[PDB]
């Protein structure tokens, strides 16, 4: 199949995958972009999901985008493998 969903970290807990699209939409052909945060109070901790559905050009953007700049911090980008790859 195809699709290597990634995870963007270093989020302000208020940013939006839209502004993120202004970056990724130019780096890789993302197929979907969501943000992870408490679904009850909305308490975000910095971390979302951005898939490139490229599994190739995306990986390159993963070594680069990893630690970019959000006008104040530096986003993060991994191949969706937080906490020891889905725990491990």
From Swiss-Prot:
Localization (cell): Nucleus; Cytoplasm
Source superkingdom: Eukaryota
Entry coiled-coil feature ranges: none
Tissue: Expressed in somatic tissues, but not in the pole cells, which are the precursors of the germline. Expressed in the anterior of the germarium.
Location of the RRM domain: 4-82
Subunit relationships: Part of a complex containing fl(2)d, Sxl and vir. Part of a complex composed of at least mei-P26, bam, bgcn and Sxl; this complex is involved in translational repression of nanos mRNA. interacts with mei-p26. Interacts with nito. Interacts with Unr; cooperates with Unr to prevent translation of msl-2 transcripts. Interacts with how; promoting nuclear retention of msl-2 transcripts.
Function per UniProt: Sex determination switch protein, which controls sexual development and dosage compensation in females. Sxl protein is only active in females: it is inactive in males throughout development. Acts as a mRNA-binding protein, which specifically binds to a subset of pre-mRNAs and mRNAs and regulates their processing and/or translation. Binds nanos mRNA and is involved in bam-bgcn mediated repression of nanos mRNA translation.
Record protein name field: Protein sex-lethal
Biological classification of the source: Eukaryota, Metazoa, Ecdysozoa, Arthropoda, Hexapoda
Gene: Sxl
Full-sequence portion shown in this chain: 122 to 209 of 354
């Amino acid at each position: 199949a195809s699709n290597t969903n990634l995870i963007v970290n270093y989020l302000p807990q208020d940013m939006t995958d839209r502004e993120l699209y202004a970056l990724f939409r130019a780096i890789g052909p993302i197929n979907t972009c969501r943000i992870m945060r408490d679904y009850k109070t909305g308490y975000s901790y910095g971390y979302a999901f951005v898939d490139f559905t490229s599994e190739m050009d995306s990986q390159r953007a993963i070594k680069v985008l990893n630690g970019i700049t959000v006008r104040n911090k530096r986003l993060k980008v991994s191949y969706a493998r937080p906490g020891g790859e889905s725990i491990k």
